[PDB]
Each structure stands twice: as C-alpha cells, then as structure tokens.
Design a protein around this ligand. Structure first.
Ligand SMILES: *[C@@H]1O[C@H](CO)[C@@H](O[C@@H]2O[C@H](CO)[C@@H](O[C@@H]3O[C@H](CO[C@H]4O[C@H](CO)[C@@H](O)[C@H](O)[C@@H]4O)[C@@H](O)[C@H](O[C@H]4O[C@H](CO)[C@@H](O)[C@H](O)[C@@H]4O)[C@@H]3O)[C@H](O)[C@H]2NC(C)=O)[C@H](O)[C@H]1NC(C)=O
Ligand SMILES: *[C@@H]1O[C@H](CO)[C@@H](O[C@@H]2O[C@H](CO)[C@@H](O[C@@H]3O[C@H](CO[C@H]4O[C@H](CO)[C@@H](O)[C@H](O)[C@@H]4O)[C@@H](O)[C@H](O[C@H]4O[C@H](CO)[C@@H](O)[C@H](O)[C@@H]4O)[C@@H]3O)[C@H](O)[C@H]2NC(C)=O)[C@H](O)[C@H]1NC(C)=O
Ligand SMILES: *[C@@H]1O[C@H](CO)[C@@H](O[C@@H]2O[C@H](CO)[C@@H](O[C@@H]3O[C@H](CO)[C@@H](O)[C@H](O[C@H]4O[C@H](CO)[C@@H](O)[C@H](O)[C@@H]4O)[C@@H]3O)[C@H](O)[C@H]2NC(C)=O)[C@H](O)[C@H]1NC(C)=O
Ligand SMILES: *[C@@H]1O[C@H](CO)[C@@H](O[C@@H]2O[C@H](CO)[C@@H](O[C@@H]3O[C@H](CO)[C@@H](O)[C@H](O[C@H]4O[C@H](CO)[C@@H](O)[C@H](O)[C@@H]4O)[C@@H]3O)[C@H](O)[C@H]2NC(C)=O)[C@H](O)[C@H]1NC(C)=O
Ligand SMILES: *[C@@H]1O[C@H](CO)[C@@H](O[C@@H]2O[C@H](CO)[C@@H](O)[C@H](O)[C@H]2NC(C)=O)[C@H](O)[C@H]1NC(C)=O
Ligand SMILES: *[C@@H]1O[C@H](CO)[C@@H](O[C@@H]2O[C@H](CO)[C@@H](O)[C@H](O)[C@H]2NC(C)=O)[C@H](O)[C@H]1NC(C)=O
Ligand SMILES: CSc1nnc(CCCO)n1-c1cc(C)c(C)c(C)c1
Ligand SMILES: CSc1nnc(CCCO)n1-c1cc(C)c(C)c(C)c1
Ligand SMILES: *[C@@H]1O[C@H](CO)[C@@H](O)[C@H](O)[C@H]1NC(C)=O
Ligand SMILES: *[C@@H]1O[C@H](CO)[C@@H](O)[C@H](O)[C@H]1NC(C)=O
Ligand SMILES: *[C@@H]1O[C@H](CO)[C@@H](O)[C@H](O)[C@H]1NC(C)=O
Ligand SMILES: *[C@@H]1O[C@H](CO)[C@@H](O)[C@H](O)[C@H]1NC(C)=O
Ligand SMILES: *[C@@H]1O[C@H](CO)[C@@H](O)[C@H](O)[C@H]1NC(C)=O
Ligand SMILES: *[C@@H]1O[C@H](CO)[C@@H](O)[C@H](O)[C@H]1NC(C)=O
Ligand SMILES: *[C@@H]1O[C@H](CO)[C@@H](O)[C@H](O)[C@H]1NC(C)=O
Ligand SMILES: *[C@@H]1O[C@H](CO)[C@@H](O)[C@H](O)[C@H]1NC(C)=O
Lengths: 730, 743
C-alpha cells in the first residue's frame, strides 16, 4: 500500500499521504480511495491530470503545499471529480479562489492564503456548500488593505450553515447573507460598527463571533490595534433582535465598557457568552444585562482588570443571582486582594454552578468557608493567586484558553481545589480549615518546604488525588501524608530541597501505610540513597514513576543494599525507570523487579547491554521500552524468553544486526535486514544494495504490516543511492 | 615541550599542572625545575619511594582525588626523600591511616575526605613544623567510623601549629593538649554537645573558633543531621571562652541555641564576625543581653532562626542592636515575618558603618520603604524572596553562610543597590519606588512582571544605572519605555516573554536610541523574530549587545530584506553575541552591515554550514571571532588577505576536515587558533601564533603525520594544550594513544 499508506475506516478507504516530501500528486494511489490527505508536502502544481480518472474521491486535503511561490492550480482542475464534497486548501499561498470548482462541494476551506476578492463565479454556484472557511487572508502582514466581497456572493449559497471570515479586514458585516447560516465567525475583521440591518435575516443563527473588533490591544502577542482612543465596538440596540436561536456569543476583546441588556431581549437560549478582555468592572458591579440570561450556562468575564488597579475587593452585582442556569463562571484577571463571604452571596443560590474560575487574580486572602455554601461546586480554580500560609493555529479559541482547568483524572474523584502557583511556602495549621470535602487538590509550585508529619491535611482527609509537584517538601517522616488514608494518586515530581543543593537523603517508608495508593510519581527527585529502609513496600500500588533519579548510584551500592528496592511493590504493573543514568542493571536487581509488571520503561539511560534472558521472569510483561540507550545486539531466540510481549521499543540504540505486535528499531545502525503489525525502521544506515533485495521482497510479501515513514527509510550507501528511499530503487 | 603535565612559571618558581589527565602513575617525564606538582583528579593507585625519585626540589604536591571512577596505596616513607616538601595535599584518597614516615619539612598537610579514624603520634607528632593541619571529613556519618580516636597529646608536640581543622568527625569532646600556638580551630559537626571551662585552656592566641553544627537545628536539612536529645542546644559552660581574648571569628551556626550567654563575650573585645545561623534566637533577638558585649563586631549573621509555622506580623528587634557600633553587615534571612515598619529598625539607623542589610527569604508582604532613607552608609538593601506586591560537597566552602556576593558586583559598583528579585511585583505600581533613597543598582528579576513600560514607572529613582529586569513578562514596545532613566548604563532584559507563554511575540526596540549613555544591553532569550515599524536598532553609546537565543534566522531570511541593517545603527558597538540564533547562513550583505567598530563577534552554537571569510575586510578592528559549535566544512586558503587585526579565532566543534596549505600563512595577526573537536585526520605542510588547540580530532597516526610532529618540536613557543587529549583515531593499536606518544 504505497506511495501512501491505505486504510479502512467505516465504509470508506483512506490514503494518508501527509508530510512526505512529495513534489507531485502521485499516480500510485489506490483506486478504492475516497479520501486523500496530501498535506504538508512539496507539491507546486495541480492540473486536471493530477486527479485523472478518479471519480470516487470524496475528500482532498492539500493543506500546507508547498513548504520551506505558492500552489499553482489550473482552472477546472477539480471539475472532473463528480463526488468531491470536502476540499481543504489551507496555507497554499493562493492569490485567488480557484476557478471551476465542482458544485458537489459541501465543505471548502481556503484559510491562510492571499485571497482579497471574494467573487461570485469563484464560489457562487457552489450551491451545496454548508461550511465555508475564508479566515486569515487579508491579515495585517502584507498587501490587502480591505477584503473585497462582491455584493451578494453568498446570497446564492442557500444551504450555507457556517461562514468564517475571521482575521480579514472587512470594516462592515457583509450584506446579503443566506438565512441558512447557523455559525458566523467575524473575529478580528475591523468591524467597529454593527447595524440593525447587518444580521436581520439570520433567524437560524446559533453562533456569532465578533471578538477582537476594537480590541483591548494590551500585551497581546499578536498585532493589536485598537479603535481610536480606548473606544469599544459599536453595536446598535436592535442589532440582535431577530437572532432568537443564538446559543454562542463571543464579544471578547471588543473594548466594551457597557453591555446593552436589550441585545439579549430576544435571545432566550443563549448558552455561552464570552466577554474576556473588555473593561466591564463597572458592568460587573451593576449589570442590567445579567437579568436577561436565564439559560446561560457559561459566562467568561476574564481579564477585565483596570490597568494599575488592585482594589481590595471584587464588586459582584446581586443580579448574578438571576443566572439560574449557570454551570461555570470564569473570572480570571479581574485582580483584587481579598475575597469575603459576602462578595459571593449572589452565586451561592445558583443551583447548577459547578465551576468557579478565579485564576490569575493575585488574591492575598480568601474567606474559604464561603465555598461551603454551594450545593454543586465541583471545581474551585484558584491558580496564580497570592494565598499565604494560614495561621498560530487558526482553529484555536484564542480568547478562551481551552483545555480542562484541572486534570480530568484528578477532578474525576470529586470536588477539586487548585491552589497551584500561590504563596504557600509552608502549610499553615489553618490552611484547609472551613473547606468543603475536597477529593482533588493541587498545590503545585508553591515553594512549599513543609516537613510532612501526618497532620497537615487532616481537615480535608478525603483527598484522593494530590499534586505536590515543584515544591521543596520533606517526606522523611514515615507518617507523612498518612492522614489521607483514602489517597489514590500522589504526584511529588520535581521536589527538591529549598536551596537546590547537591546531597539530600530520602525515606520512603510512608508509602506502605496507604492501603489504596495506586499511582505514585517520584520523578526528578534526584533520589540516590534511602535511609534506614532500602525497600519500597506497597500492597496497593499499581504505578511507580521513578524517572530522573539515581538508580545507577542505588544499584552500584558496594553492599548491594538496594537489590530488592521495588520487589515489595507486589501489585505493580507499570514502572518508569527512564533518565536514571543506567549503564548496567545488576542481573539480580532486574530479577527483583515485581513479577506483576505489564509495562517497563528504561528509556533514555546509557544501557550498553540488556540481559534478554530475564524476561522469562516476567510472564505478564506487555511493553518494554528501551529507547535512547547504547545497546549493541539482540538475542536470536526472543520467543524462548517471553510469550507476553506485544510492544518493544528500541529506537535510538546501537543495534547493527538482526508473539508480539509492535517493533520499533528506528534510529539504529542497521545496514541491512536478513531474515506483528508495526515495524519502525527509519533512520538506519541501510546499504542500498542487492543484499537488501531480501528485505524488499519481505515487505511486498507482508502488506498488512505497517511501516511508517517509508520515505525516511533511507539508503546511506553506497554513494550511488545514498539519500534515496530504499523502496523506489530496483 | 612538557608532557604529560603542563608546566608554567608562577611568580618565582616553576609549576606543573598534571590534573585530570587520566594518569595511572606519577610521571618520570616531569620537568626538573618544577617545585609544585598538581597530580590531582587522576587514576593513580600507588605511591612508592620511586614515584618522586629525582625531584628533590619539590615543595608542594597535590595528590587529591586519586584514583577515580579501593583507594591510594602509599608505601611507608614514600615522601621521606623530599627534604623540601612543605605542602602535601592528600584529599579524597580513600586512605585508612595517616601515611607513615612523612618528612619533617611539612608546614601544611591536608588529609580531608579519607577513612582515618586514629590520629596517632607517629603519624603526625614530630612534624614539628606543621602550621596548618586539615583532618576534616574522615569519620562522617557514612560508613565505618563509629567514633574518631585521637591519641592523647598527639598535637602538644606541634608547637607551631596555627590551624587545626577536625570538622566533620565524631569527637564527642574537644581534644585535650592542644598547642598554644593555635590561631584557628575548626570543630564544626563533631558531635561535641558540651564545652567545658577547661576545653580551651591556654589557647590565648586563638582568633577563630568554629563550633557550628553541634546539636544541629536539623529541620529540612540538605545534609544528614542528628539533633541532640529533645530540641536541646549545645551546652557551653559560662567560662568556656574566658581566656580567648584574641578571638575575632566565632561560628555557632546550627547549635540549636535558644539563649546566648553574654558572659561568653566578656573577655572577647575584638570579636569581628559572629555566625548564629540556624538556631532558635527569635527571643534573644528581641531582648539580647549579649548585644551590648560586641562593640567591635562587623558582621552578624542571625539567619534562619524562624520558628516552625510562625509567620508573625512583625519582627521584634532589640534596642540593644544600637550597641553594635562597628556593624558593617547584618544578615537576617529567614526570620519570616509579614511587615517591616519604620520603628522596627530604629536601632540600626544610628550604626555609622552599616552598609549591608540582608533581609532575603523572609516572605515580607510590606515594607515601609522610607525607613531606608535614615541610613548614612547603606550600600546594599537585599530583599530577594519576599512578597512585596504592586504599590498603589566541597569541604572548603562555608557550609552555613552562603558565600558569593549578594548582588552582582558590576551592579553594586554603580552605587546603592536594591534587590527586589523574586517578590510579587506582577506590575509596577505608581508608588513602587516612592520614598526610596537614590538607587543606582536595581534588581527586579523574576517577579512575573507584565508592565507595559511607558516612561513613568521609574521616575522616583531616576538615577538607576544598572537595571536587571530578567525573567519578567514586560512589554517594551512603547518607544518611551525606561526613558525616565536617562543615566542608565546597563539593561538586562534576558528571558523576557509574554505572561501566557504564548509564542508569536512582536517587538519594538526604538526606546534604545533615547539613552545617550547606555553601554550594555542584554536581549538574550527573548525569542525575537520580528520587529514592528522600525527594523533598525540605533545607538550612539552602546558598546555591548547580547542577542543570543533569538531568531535572526527568521529576521534575516526575510523576503523583503527588511533587517539587512538591523544592527548597523549601533555605531559604537564593539561586542556582539549572536549565539543560539539557529543561523544556517548569514546573507552576505547582512553580515557587512554589522557595525564596523566590532572587536568581538560571537556566532557560536548556531548551524552555520558556510562562512564568507572575505567579509572580514569590512572589520579592521575585529580581534575575536567565535564560531564554535557550528557545521563549517573548510577554511579559506589565504586568511591574511581578509584581516590584519584578528588575534583569536575559535573553531571548536565544527566539521573542518582539511587545513588549507598556505593557511596559517602570511599575515599572522593571529595569536590563538582553536581547532579542537573538528574532523582533522592530519596536518600537512603549512607566524605570531602562540596557542593552537587541536584535541578531539580523529588523527590518522600513520606515518604522514610525522610532518606535523616535527613541526611541533620546531615551534616550542606555540602552546598546545591538552596534548594528552590530542589522540590517534587510526590505525588500531595507535587508536587512543596521544600522537606525541607515537615513535
Ligand atoms: C507523574 O506520573 C503520573 C502517572 O504517570 C502522570 O500522570 C499521568 O499522565 C499521563 C500522561 O503522561 C496520563 O495519561 C494520558 O491520559 C489521557 C486521558 O486518558 C483518557 O482515555 C483513556 C483511554 O484508555 C482512559 O484510560 C482514561 O481513563 C482517560 O479517560 C490520554 O489521552 C493519554 O493517551 C495517551 O496514549 C495514546 C496511545 O495509546 C495516545 O494516542 C495519546 O496521545 C496519549 O499519549 C494518556 O494516557 C495519565 O492519565 C496520568 N495519570 C494520572 C493518575 O494523572 C503525571 O503527569 C506525572 N507528573 C508529571 C509532572 O510529570
Ligand atoms: C546579559 O548580558 C550581560 C553582558 O554580557 C551579562 O553581564 C556580564 O556577564 C559576564 C559574565 O558572564 C561578566 O564578565 C565577567 O566579569 C567578571 C568580573 O570581572 C572582574 O575582573 C576583571 C579583571 O580583568 C575585570 O575585567 C572586570 O572589570 C571585573 O573587575 C570576570 O571575572 C569574568 O572573567 C572571565 O574571563 C576570564 C578569562 O580571561 C576567566 O578567567 C573568568 O573566569 C571569566 O571567564 C567575566 O569577564 C560581565 O562582567 C558582565 N557585565 C555586566 C555589565 O554586568 C549578564 O550576565 C547577562 N544576563 C544574563 C541573565 O545572562
Ligand atoms: C469565540 O467564541 C466561540 C464560542 O462562543 C468560539 O467558537 C469555537 O471556535 C473553536 C475554534 O475555531 C471551534 O473549535 C473547533 O471545532 C471544530 C468543529 O468540530 C473542530 O474542527 C476543531 O477540533 C480540531 O482541531 C483542534 C485544534 O486545532 C484539535 O485539537 C481537535 O482534535 C480537532 O482536530 C475545534 O474543536 C469551536 O467549534 C467553536 N465553537 C462552536 C462552533 O460552538 C470562537 O473560536 C471564539 N473566537 C475566538 C477568536 O477565539
Ligand atoms: C564558620 O565560620 C567561619 C568564619 O567564622 C568559617 O571559616 C571560613 O571557612 C572558609 C571555608 O574553608 C574559608 O574560606 C577559604 O579560605 C581559604 C584560605 O584563605 C581558601 O583556601 C578558600 O578558597 C579556596 O576555595 C574557594 C572555593 O572552595 C576558591 O574560591 C579558591 O580558589 C580556593 O581554592 C576559601 O576562601 C575561610 O578561610 C574561613 N574563615 C577564616 C579562616 O577566617 C567556617 O567555614 C564556618 N564553618 C562552616 C562549617 O561553615
Ligand atoms: C497543577 O498545577 C499545574 C500548574 O497549573 C499544572 O501543570 C500544567 O500541566 C499541564 C497539563 O498537563 C501542562 O501542559 C503544563 O505544562 C503545566 N503547567 C505548568 C504551569 O507547569 C498541573 O497539571 C496541575 N495538576 C492538576 C492535577 O490539575
Ligand atoms: C537578580 O536576582 C537574581 C535572582 O536572585 C540573580 O540571579 C542569580 O544570578 C547568579 C549570578 O549571575 C546565579 O549564580 C544564580 O543562579 C541566579 N539565580 C537565579 C534564580 O536565577 C541575579 O544575579 C540578580 N542580579 C544582579 C545584578 O545581581
Ligand atoms: C492586575 S492589574 C494590572 N495593571 N497593570 C497590569 C499589567 C500592565 C498592563 O497590562 N496588570 C496586570 C494584569 C494582568 C491580567 C496580569 C496577568 C498581570 C501580570 C498584571
Ligand atoms: C518561616 S516559617 C516555616 N515554618 N515551617 C517552614 C518549613 C519547614 C522547615 O523545615 N517554614 C519555612 C521556613 C523557611 C526558612 C522557608 C524558606 C520556608 C519555605 C518555610
Ligand atoms: C433553518 O433551519 C431549519 C431546520 O430547523 C430548516 O428547515 C430551514 O430550511 C432553515 N432555514 C433556511 C435554509 O433558510
Ligand atoms: C441543572 O442541571 C440539570 C441536569 O443537567 C437540568 O435538568 C436542570 O434543568 C438544570 N437547572 C437549570 C436551572 O437549568
Ligand atoms: C491491584 O491493583 C488493582 C487496581 O489496579 C486493585 O483492584 C487491587 O486491589 C490490587 N490487587 C492486590 C492483590 O493488591
Ligand atoms: C543473565 O544473567 C543470569 C544471572 O541471573 C546469567 O545466568 C546469564 O548468564 C546472563 N545472560 C547473559 C547473556 O549475560
Ligand atoms: C602567639 O602569637 C604571637 C603572634 O601573634 C607570637 O608572638 C607568640 O609567640 C605566639 N605564641 C606561640 C607561638 O606560642
Ligand atoms: C567605620 O569604617 C572606617 C573605615 O573603614 C573605620 O576607620 C571606622 O573605625 C569605622 N567605624 C567604627 C565605629 O568602627
Ligand atoms: C564608544 O565606547 C568606547 C568604549 O568602548 C569609548 O572609548 C568611546 O569613547 C565611545 N564612543 C562614543 C561615540 O560614545
Ligand atoms: C563573499 O561575498 C562577497 C560579496 O562581497 C563575494 O564577492 C564573494 O564571492 C563571496 N565569497 C564566497 C566564498 O561566497
């Protein structure tokens, strides 16, 4: 299956031809293929011969061609393809919409080109278009002052559901838009005024994006140019009167000081409202508009701080109690010093509020008991505040940061409190007094140097997932954290002494006291020696991450004190030993790794030899990861030593000569192959020669097996073929 | 030409540096003129009386850290031959006993980091000339030495002994029968929990006593630590120090002290330096009888005396601090408190010579900054690692008192220095610097500070000369940025990025030209890839631009050639750092538009495949050219035709495989040529050259090299370092031998 890999999905067969240095549309493409991904290549010309005799094609991706003049597409180059629905032509340095596109198309993407004329003929006549993407064409870099949209070019597209013109200079919403529209994206379009007539038709509209017009252009990485003065976007009172279906409204970075409550009079289903990066401190305090949003589930009022203002208190309108459907409130970057019980009274009566996001407010103190008064809080996000011890890609939501606030696997356990990146340099006795019952707690990165003694967390004893990463904690005391008898996940990654000094010693006895600890992460603790007790012991532990410590020192111990260090983890199935500067694992030591192991990582060490013999000791082992070592040869008789192994990763080793499903030998020193569904081989210095004919034939006799990056499976020698993919030659 | 050691003249005397050379024996190829021999950090296993035969003149030997990667075997009387041996260093040698038969000539002996548990007469008594004896670290916590045994009176015979260090051994009690000659006695970490009146006896000449780390304050300690019973402090008799009238330096750090007996200092009128770090003296700081007893104290360290879990509103400073009349530096780190008021520091305001106040690591939320106006000689206000908001191992180091300058000397040289690094100044409040004295040196490093600089932020301290803004998230796009500091000479904006760590950051560097006396600017690691509106840096004054870790590759592959002249407007620039800019190729005309004034050009750690040597003609003043760590393949045949000014050319870690014949030829304005770590197999046939570095090349040790070998012997002036690492790659049997080794 070449030159592309060809694969089943659904009832459709797919050709992945992305990122392979192709200089032309191959003619070696499977005839069954209905979707062709040619993205991120070096293709320069598309003609009506490029896709000849291929009626079946339904989707083509030509994005990012070519790399490192743009893409030349003849007139009617695609017209032949009677079934073409989806055509992606992003980042192609196109100067005009290609002429003679097939009427079959339902999705067309021309983002990141140089198209300044949206002409009928170009797109008129593509009546079947549902989704049309024209964003990022007349962006500030280079020639287009304004994007010329021929009058009524879209009125003919009466099935158009999505139109994106974001990141082009338009000045005004185009007239003569089809009523069929459901999602209209007009972010960053230099539209400083919205008339009553601009959206009058669009009854079916569920999403409107006007973000970044009259931007709040403060320290924004991307070019930012506000309207004259600090002037906000101008939106007519009745601009939105006929948009009864709107669910998503984005007004981020429109320099808004006032929000007209009449905008929402006829908008009873509004679900999500983005008001990040405006100046709505006043409006938050009064807030007529808040009574008009009884179905709002998500409100983002982030980064509406006033420059230079660090008020004692936040002023929350009482009208917030009228957001009855509110599930998530995002109030980052208001910036204020104190949160009192009373300031959040309006929110205490909202029945479905499960997320309060107060990140990046530099709050010095919070009256923490106030969070007891919420019936459905699942997420309290307080990262980047100042709590003390208590005694690019177009398809990104630029204005709203998009990944989960708290790691899903932590918040899964229950109520989550994230106090990362605050001032909690030690754990005060009253640190967690008056909190609700917390299951997930983040203390990451507080320069916290607490000597854990078994009393610090007793006020929230039902924590299940505890992130303590990037602190300077001492867990020598065997009672450390034992007050959390229900703890399942503990992350102590990157924990070191305060002074970041050479030395330190560890005592890991506290581990055994937990009867339900599942995952423990000790990565990059620079553990080189254990005190008094040389064995980790746990009946419950399933995953130990030990990367970035000094097992080289521990196992070269003159007394062999640590030969059985992990053996006491009787239930362990995953072990990470990466980055331990291992040259040689004493045979004995390796045999005393838990027999229960399922996944063993010893990558990025300096292993010169591996005793393959010992694998019989691990009947359950499925994955063995030995990447990035210095290994020289493989055993001839692997089948003797394991029946279990599915995946063996050997990339970045020195192997020069040659029951399971995946073998990675990429980036080794193989000159040839003499004589299971994935074999990785790229990066080996193949001697492209006839000896190689054996292996070549083997490839043809096993098409099911996947070999990725064939294009990077390269002849090194002799000189005649060097740099040539082994497959092309005969 | 010396081998294996490098030999040099130091003062009057000749010296051999044979450190870290993988030697497996004491060489016999050592210069006869040599009086000091450094064989440290090698693979030597045996020292016999033959090791140093024919080196009578040796005065100092360093055998430290032999061997590397069981210990060093020294025969009896191995050194006895050497009549002039004064200084013998035997550190980290895994020795089990003091070598027997040491020469009586010794004045300094160091046996630190070994396994010596018996300090015997026979070992050292009768080395009557010893002045300095170091026996620290022999019976530490790790391994066998349960306790360390000192034969009675072993030191009484050493009547010239001035320094005795027994730190980091288990002793339990100060040894008896110590010579009166002692001036410095180090007993740190010796498990000595009690000090009697009799312990210091007749040590009337003593100027330094170190008792730190006995009954340690163990909390969170970086190194293994064992406190005494309960939280008990060291026990020091009232009269323990009554006859130590000369004492100048007393170290009581980490002795768990709650109370300081003022009678300890009754007879100690000259005490200069007093270390009390890591104790529990919060109470004593508030009352502090002892403070009246120290009129000549210049340095007081009361750091890290915080109480566990205590974060009091206020610090309580005794009025008795006003009796420390000679005080030059006060170190009060890690007391930990929330607020500093004017009144709290009244006692210190009247001390005439107090020039350093060190309040690092106190997590102070607010300070009444006007209070520092009331000090006549403050040169250093050190406030790192506090919580100010916006206003609207090596045994020869001090183990307890962190030793480098608090503030970079080159910053503090300009004047009063204020260090507010690692605080909470996420923006610059309008009142940030209201009420400060006149500050010349200011550190704002690492405050997550996202200020949009507009030319007003620093107007209350307008005479700042050295400004460190590193590791913040500042915007200096406004051309008025920092212009209120018209006297600014040094600006460090290293590691400045957007708050949200989102990339794509654009820059405007017009503000630079406003300063008529800006000398050094550091824009390193700002990931600058594009400039808005103005594409030229311009300055009449600037001498040094550090531009490392930006994207000149992007800037110079500009399709419009917008940045061909980017630096040309820096008319006075003499040093430019272009390292780490991912440069593959510098457009010829971009290189020509680098300032002609340049004296030092660094383009190292890029990916240069080619270098247009011809352009060096445009730089008649260029003295240093640094092209290390690139991908360069060959050298022009006649460098002399392109420069008559170049002294130093660094080409380490490049792909050069052939030396042009007639190169290194003609004009020789070249003193230093570094071709180490390249791909040279040999050097053919073909100067004021005085250093040639060649180590790390895969030399082909077959007979053709003989040319180069002979050339070495015929040019002894030319220094070639690391000859031991100038190594045959081929043919096998020669591989791994130094080429000088070949017959
Ligand atoms: C300290 O050490 C701990 C434990 O190792 C680290 O925590 C783990 O981090 C890993 C990422 O390293 C997490 O694994 C990732 O979880 C994602 C979510 O998984 C969902 O779907 C799976 C399907 O099986 C479910 O099992 C699961 O319940 C979730 O609903 C996955 O998206 C990731 O998938 C990965 O594998 C596939 C290949 O099969 C790839 O296609 C993906 O791209 C990706 O590589 C991944 O599995 C794991 O969840 C974490 N565990 C815990 C307890 O949090 C910490 O990160 C570490 N700390 C630090 C600072 O390093
Ligand atoms: C942003 O950019 C600036 C400018 O580069 C950096 O500040 C400079 O940092 C360098 C070191 O990285 C400083 O250079 C060092 O100065 C030391 C002090 O020198 C004293 O003694 C000499 C005696 O000749 C005098 O010339 C000098 O005036 C001082 O009295 C030197 O000790 C260093 O010497 C180096 O060279 C010799 C080789 O001959 C070696 O033996 C030394 O060990 C060492 O390698 C060195 O010259 C420079 O002084 C700083 N300048 C300023 C203005 O501050 C900032 O570091 C940078 N910021 C960041 C975050 O990188
Ligand atoms: C203004 O706010 C609105 C919300 O009110 C916001 O609209 C959202 O835009 C984002 C980004 O363009 C859309 O997210 C995409 O959804 C599509 C369709 O299902 C997917 O193709 C995308 O996922 C792919 O690509 C991702 C990243 O490139 C990958 O991570 C992913 O695996 C997929 O391969 C992506 O999720 C989102 O649909 C809309 N919201 C809607 C339609 O309701 C708008 O972007 C805001 N404006 C700005 C400038 O931020
Ligand atoms: C308790 O406090 C006392 C001071 O009251 C302190 O004594 C000091 O010890 C340090 C460390 O040994 C000494 O500083 C050294 O002085 C000597 C001689 O002049 C030098 O050899 C040392 O420099 C060498 O090493 C340095 C780095 O290791 C290098 O910079 C240099 O190149 C040299 O190779 C170093 O400057 C100091 O002499 C004494 N103070 C005296 C004698 O007054 C003692 O260390 C404290 N105790 C503990 C446990 O910390
Ligand atoms: C606790 O807080 C830290 C900081 O917010 C989180 O660390 C980030 O993790 C994400 C997602 O895995 C990474 O992509 C980022 O690089 C990390 N950010 C920083 C600032 O280090 C961490 O995930 C949080 N822990 C939990 C369980 O939610
Ligand atoms: C400003 O404060 C920062 C942090 O205190 C100083 O940064 C240290 O610089 C020294 C010497 O160059 C290094 O050895 C340390 O590793 C640095 N620490 C950190 C956390 O970066 C900086 O030197 C100070 N600036 C001045 C001018 O004194
Ligand atoms: C907090 S009120 C404020 N006033 N000036 C600033 C920065 C300068 C103008 O952009 N900030 C501020 C605001 C925000 C949102 C963050 C993240 C930071 C670091 C600082
Ligand atoms: C100062 S109050 C305090 N109470 N317990 C601690 C840590 C436990 C001591 O081993 N700290 C504290 C003290 C210091 C000195 C620093 C630096 C930190 C981060 C915290
Ligand atoms: C609006 O959407 C509905 C589906 O609810 C559809 O039937 C109608 O035709 C759409 N309006 C158009 C295409 O103008
Ligand atoms: C709260 O959530 C439930 C389930 O998602 C839903 O039925 C209910 O209507 C929501 N409450 C409001 C006021 O919307
Ligand atoms: C092993 O861990 C699993 C979870 O992965 C758990 O259900 C079980 O309790 C553990 N088994 C034993 C024998 O401890
Ligand atoms: C692997 O180690 C075992 C010791 O348990 C030994 O018997 C065997 O010889 C080793 N195999 C190899 C190839 O070194
Ligand atoms: C004590 O010190 C002085 C030098 O400061 C000296 O004159 C006297 O002899 C010394 N005592 C000895 C060597 O016993
Ligand atoms: C202050 O310093 C000067 C010069 O360094 C010195 O002469 C003077 O004695 C010192 N003052 C006191 C009170 O010791
Ligand atoms: C440039 O700086 C140098 C110091 O390198 C100095 O000698 C010269 O006077 C300065 N010239 C100007 C014009 O500032
Ligand atoms: C270097 O550039 C100059 C242009 O000034 C040109 O004359 C010369 O040929 C170039 N040399 C090389 C080796 O490219």
């Amino acid at each position: 299956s070449y030159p592309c890999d060809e694969k089943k999905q659904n009832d459709s067969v797919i050709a992945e031809c992305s990122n392979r240095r192709l200089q032309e549309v191959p003619q070696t493409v499977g005839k069954y293929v209905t979707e062709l991904d040619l993205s991120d290549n070096f293709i320069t010309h598309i003609t009506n011969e490029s896709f000849q005799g291929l009626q079946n094609l339904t989707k083509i991706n030509l994005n990012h061609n070519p790399n490192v003049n743009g893409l030349n597409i003849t007139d009617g180059a695609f017209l032949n393809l009677k079934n073409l629905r989806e055509l992606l032509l992003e980042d192609n340095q196109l100067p005009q919409i290609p002429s003679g596109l097939p009427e079959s198309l339902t999705e067309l993407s021309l983002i990141q080109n140089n198209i300044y004329n949206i002409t009928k003929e170009g797109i008129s006549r593509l009546i079947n278009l549902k989704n049309l993407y024209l964003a990022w064409n007349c962006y500030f870099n280079k020639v287009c002052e304004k994007t010329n949209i021929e009058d009524g070019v879209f009125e003919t597209l009466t099935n158009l559901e999505l139109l994106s013109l974001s990141f082009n200079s338009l000045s005004h919403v185009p007239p003569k838009l089809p009523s069929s529209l459901r999602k209209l994206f007009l972010s960053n379009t230099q539209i400083k005024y919205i008339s009553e007539e601009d959206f009058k038709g669009l009854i079916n509209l569920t999403l409107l994006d006007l973000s970044g017009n009259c931007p709040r252009c403060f320290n924004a990485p991307f070019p930012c140019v506000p309207c004259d003065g600090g002037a906000s976007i101008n939106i007519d009172r009745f601009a939105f009167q006929n948009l009864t279906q709107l669910r998503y409204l984005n007004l981020s970075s429109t320099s808004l000081r006032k929000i007209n409550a009449a905008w929402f009079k006829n908008m009873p289903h509004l679900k999500v409202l983005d008001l990040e990066f405006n100046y709505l401190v006043g409006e938050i305090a009064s807030g007529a508009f808040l009574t008009m949003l009884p179905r709002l589930e998500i409100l983002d009022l982030s980064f509406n701080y006033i420059k230079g203002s660090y008020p004692q208190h936040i002023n929350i309108s009482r009208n917030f109690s009228k957001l009855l459907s509110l599930r998530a409130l995002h109030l980052r970057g208001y910036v204020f010093q104190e949160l009192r019980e009373d300031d959040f009274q309006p929110l205490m009566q909202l029945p479905n509020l499960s997320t309060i996001n107060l990140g990046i407010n530099f709050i010095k103190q919070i009256d923490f008991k106030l969070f007891q008064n919420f019936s459905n809080l699942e997420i309290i996000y307080l990262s980047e505040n100042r709590i003390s011890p208590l005694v690019f890609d177009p398809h990104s939501n630029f204005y709203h940061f998009t990944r989960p606030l708290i790691k899903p696997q932590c918040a899964a356990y229950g109520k989550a409190l994230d106090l990362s990146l605050n001032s909690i340099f030690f754990i005060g006795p009253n640190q967690f007094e008056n909190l609700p019952d917390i299951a997930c707690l983040n203390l990451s990165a507080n320069s916290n140097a607490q000597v854990l003694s078994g009393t610090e967390f007793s006020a929230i004893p039902h924590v299940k997932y505890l992130d303590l990463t990037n602190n300077r904690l001492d867990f020598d005391n065997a009672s450390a954290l034992t007050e959390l008898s229900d703890l399942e996940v503990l992350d102590l990654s990157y924990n070191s002494h305060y002074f970041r000094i050479a030395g330190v010693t560890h005592h890991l006895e506290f581990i055994q006291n937990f009867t339900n600890l599942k995952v423990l992460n000790l990565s990059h603790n620079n553990i080189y020696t254990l005190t008094d007790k040389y064995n980790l012991e746990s009946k419950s532990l399933v995953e130990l991450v030990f990367s970035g410590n000094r097992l080289d020192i521990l196992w070269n111990d003159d007394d062999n004190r640590y030969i059985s260090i992990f053996k006491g983890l009787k239930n362990l199935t995953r072990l990470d030993l990466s980055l331990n500067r291992l040259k040689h694992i004493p045979n004995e030591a390796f045999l005393n790794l838990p027999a229960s192991l399922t996944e063993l990582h010893i990558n990025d060490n300096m292993l010169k030899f591996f005793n393959w013999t010992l694998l019989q000791q691990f009947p359950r082992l499925e994955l063995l990861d030995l990447r990035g070592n210095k290994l020289l040869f493989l055993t001839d008789s692997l089948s003797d030593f394991t029946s279990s192994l599915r995946t063996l990763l050997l990339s970045h080793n020195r192997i020069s000569h040659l029951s399971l499903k995946h073998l990675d030998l990429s980036s080794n020193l193989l000159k040839t192959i003499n004589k299971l569904s994935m074999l990785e081989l790229h990066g080996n210095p193949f001697e492209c020669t006839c000896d190689i004919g054996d292996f070549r034939r083997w490839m043809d006799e096993h098409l099911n097996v996947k070999i990725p990056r064939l294009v990077d499976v390269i002849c090194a020698s002799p000189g005649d073929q060097r740099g040539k993919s082994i497959v092309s030659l005969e």
